[PDB]
Amino acid sequence: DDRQLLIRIKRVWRDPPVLAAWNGSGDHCTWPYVTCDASGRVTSLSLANTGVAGPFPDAIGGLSGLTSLDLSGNYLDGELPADIGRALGKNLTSLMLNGNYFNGTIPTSLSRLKNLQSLALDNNFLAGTIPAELGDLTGLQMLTLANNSFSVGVLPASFKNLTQLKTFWAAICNLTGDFPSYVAEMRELEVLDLSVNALTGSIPPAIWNLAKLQTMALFANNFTGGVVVADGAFSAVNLVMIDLSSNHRLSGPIPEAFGHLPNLETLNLYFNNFSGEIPASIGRLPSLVTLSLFRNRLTGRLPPDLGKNSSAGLMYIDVDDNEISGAIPEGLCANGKFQSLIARNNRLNGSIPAGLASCATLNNLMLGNNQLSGEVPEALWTVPQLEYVLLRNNRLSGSLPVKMFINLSTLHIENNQFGGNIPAAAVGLREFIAGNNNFSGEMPASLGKGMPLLQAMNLSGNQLFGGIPSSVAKLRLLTQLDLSRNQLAGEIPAELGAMRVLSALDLSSNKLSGYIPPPLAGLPLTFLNLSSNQLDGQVPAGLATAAYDRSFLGNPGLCHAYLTGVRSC
Amino acid sequence: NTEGDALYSLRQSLKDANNVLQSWDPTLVNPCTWFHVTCNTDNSVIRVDLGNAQLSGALVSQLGQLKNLQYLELYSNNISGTIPLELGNLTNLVSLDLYLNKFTGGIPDTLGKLLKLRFLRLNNNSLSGQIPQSLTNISTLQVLDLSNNNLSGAVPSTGSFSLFTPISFGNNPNL
């Protein structure tokens, strides 16, 4: 009789092609996805991500002796029967209904199956509120109710009765209220994922006492106060991850107990108001891989030792907005896998360490707006790979090489004291912004084949002399140009008006002379200032309306046949 | 960041052939490090250049949360649809270029609240309706090239429209 019951489930799902072998072929135990006990009755139904579709069958309740039931990842929809707990079975322990398209609310009869060990109604389309009766399953070992379309509701207090949980994945369920005080009494937790919600209160000082945690994640909440972990209670040596990520109101100094975890791999404590000095204890953990403290009010200095160990895993450092002072750590890239360093908008001073300029694994250096000084080593532009350099608003000095890296694509060295000559080949560059520097010498002859991908160039305030290259017109996708406050002389290129997307041309306060190019008028220009020069002749018709008023002022030899500072021919 | 979300929503509603928006990662905090986006010193989007890049699809109504936008360029593309009514919420807009496209509909009333506009070109489009009178309240407007369309009605002759010559409104038989 079990054959008809088993095939009825397939008939309900309109005979999916996956279960094509379920056609009266003797015993049903050799059928795929079906397992029988010694008596022949079905004990496991594993149909994970097979492809079935349709409503939840009601004939499964006739499969007495069912012990494992997995229907995750399929396209099942509809509504779970209200009498699921009265007929589905009595020997099941692995109910897994997750990732489906189930509608409606969670049935309250699920408390009548007190033998479960795993219940995962997550990533569904449920609605309402988490029932209190769900706390009656004292034998639970993994409960995941996440990413559901719930309403404003607080976790029931009956959840304090679950003292054997191993995974609490309540990620996104519209929660409010205070932080649960019974979490610290579940002395078996391995993953705690109370995630983006509206919870409020202070992090208890007893949650750090469970010596079985492996992942701590509280991303977006309304927690206040400060982490007040006390001495003599730190025992979570197996903790791997801490992600107090964004609460906007956490205060107090960073706890000193975070520098004694021999397995920590990710520390994220940004978007808060932590103060005090970053503890020096975290510079010797031979497991750290990511340290992120984007925005805070931390003072003091970076830890002196960071990555000195040759066998470590430090690859990411990111402190993007703080009040940190001091000097960059010396031995950062000693293991040989360092890939990033972000210390923008800080008050560190000193110079670029020699170790950081020779690490041939770098990917992204983002030091800026600090008070650095000294001279940048010449090896920083040759040995390490580099795709994003943002050294802005410093007092650095140096000299760029003739040829840059083949994959450099962003260079912001504005407001510095760099010297030397302009690089002649930086294939792959798309943003060369460098103003108020000390560059000198004639600009490179071609500058149109070594940088064919340039999109924005700025060289105002330099000391370059010579003439404008004629190959600049060969840069197809260039939008912004600026060579003002220089000593350039010669003639404006006649092909400068033939490029495609030129929209910003600033060539003021120079020593140029000659006639304004006519085809310059036929451009989508939105800004232009060819003033304070030694140009001669007449303004071409079209670039003379009231829009271009303060553009040609200061030219004694210029006249119009509406403008300020321009005489009449 | 709301500006990043708005730009990503614009990306989702636009189809690209040669993948000019490959670097618009939504996970980044600020969108200034993106390509084709220029910011000021305070990490605010103040320029978006997307001219002569093969694109298609339609704009979105989320292009109104960029308060500090100053130059919006989306010309020489294959975009089609209607101009969003929220474009008048950009109080600091200085130059609005949308020419050489396949737009249709009508010039929104909301493009009269902009008191800093200087350029307004809508060449080679398929807009219809009538020219709003609110354009006369923009005293700072200097360049206007509403031509090659299907507009109608009466041409305004008061305010800043007095200085404009007939070349501004050309190839409009129903005007």
Binding site: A146, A217, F219, A220, S245, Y316, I342 | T27, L28
Partner: peptide
């Protein structure tokens, strides 16, 4: 399946243009 995410997956908000995959920017 329907979507990603599992257990204690990390957050996504970073300034790094080249970061390991995984996460969604919350905050």
């Amino acid at each position: 399946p329907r979507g990603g995410g599992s257990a204690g997956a990390p957050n996504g908000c970073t300034n790094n243009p080249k970061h390991p995959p995984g996460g969604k920017c919350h905050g």
